[PDB]
Amino acid sequence: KAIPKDQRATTPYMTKYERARILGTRALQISMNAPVFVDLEGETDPLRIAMKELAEKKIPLVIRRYLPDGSFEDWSVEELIVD
């Protein structure tokens, strides 16, 4: 039932699955004409643009980590420490 921010006791590191689905969904949105928040260096492939947004944490998403008891947490990808 939405655990508050002071009680979030999950791993602050972004896993490979979270990075994978964030890059996949973000790249899918970029392929569907989504507003890009980072200036492009001449890229054409959507996955490279998604990784470019992840490298600067400009992806506007938040992860709803489901807990085994039915609860969940909201860890934004901007505050998640990548790698």
Partner 1 sequence: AGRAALYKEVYNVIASDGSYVNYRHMALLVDVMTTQGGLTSVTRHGFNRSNTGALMRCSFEETVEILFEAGASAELDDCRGVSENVILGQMAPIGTGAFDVMIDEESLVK
Partner 2 sequence: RLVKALEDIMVHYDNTTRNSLGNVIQFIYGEDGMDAAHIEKQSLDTIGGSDAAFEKRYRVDLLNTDHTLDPSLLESGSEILGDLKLQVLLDEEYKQLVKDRKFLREVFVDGEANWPLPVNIRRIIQNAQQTFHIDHTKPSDLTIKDIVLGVKDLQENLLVLRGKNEIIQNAQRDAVTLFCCLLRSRLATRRVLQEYRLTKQAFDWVLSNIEAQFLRSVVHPGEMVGVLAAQSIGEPATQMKVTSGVPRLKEILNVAKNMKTPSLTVY
Partner 3 sequence: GQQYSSAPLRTVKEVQFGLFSPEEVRAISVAKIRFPETMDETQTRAKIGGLNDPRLGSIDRNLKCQTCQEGMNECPGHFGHIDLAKPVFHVGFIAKIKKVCECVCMHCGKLLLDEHNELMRQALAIKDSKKRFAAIWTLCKTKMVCETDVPSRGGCGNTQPTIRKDGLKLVGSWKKPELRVLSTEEILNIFKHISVKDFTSLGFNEVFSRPEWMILTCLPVPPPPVRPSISFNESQRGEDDLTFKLADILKANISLETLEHNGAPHHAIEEAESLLQFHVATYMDNDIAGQPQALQKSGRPVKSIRARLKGKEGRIRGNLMGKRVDFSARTVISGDPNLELDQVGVPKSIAKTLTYPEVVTPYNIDRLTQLVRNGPNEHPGAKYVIRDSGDRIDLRYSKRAGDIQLQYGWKVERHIMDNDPVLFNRQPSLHKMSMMAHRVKVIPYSTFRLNLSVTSPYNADFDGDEMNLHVPQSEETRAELSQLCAVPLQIVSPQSNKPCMGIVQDTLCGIRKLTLRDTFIELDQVLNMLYWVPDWDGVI
List residues near partner 1 by CB under 8 A. 17-18, 20-22, 24-25, 37, 58, 60-66, 74, 76, 78
32: contact with partner 3 by CB under 8 A: yes
Residue of 4, 16, 35, 39 that binds partner 2 (CB under 8 A): 16
Binder of residue 78, out of partner 1, partner 2, partner 3, none (CB less than 5 to 8 A by kind): partner 1
46: contact with partner 3 by CB under 8 A: yes
- Tell me how far apart the alpha carbons of residues 75 and 52 are, in angstroms, rounded to a whole number: 20
CB 50 within 8 A of CB 25: no
Count of residues in contact with partner 2, rule CB under 8 A: 12
- Tell me how far apart the alpha carbons of residues 19 and 83 are, in angstroms, rounded to a whole number: 9
* Residues binding partner 2 (CB under 8 A): 9-13, 15-17, 65-68
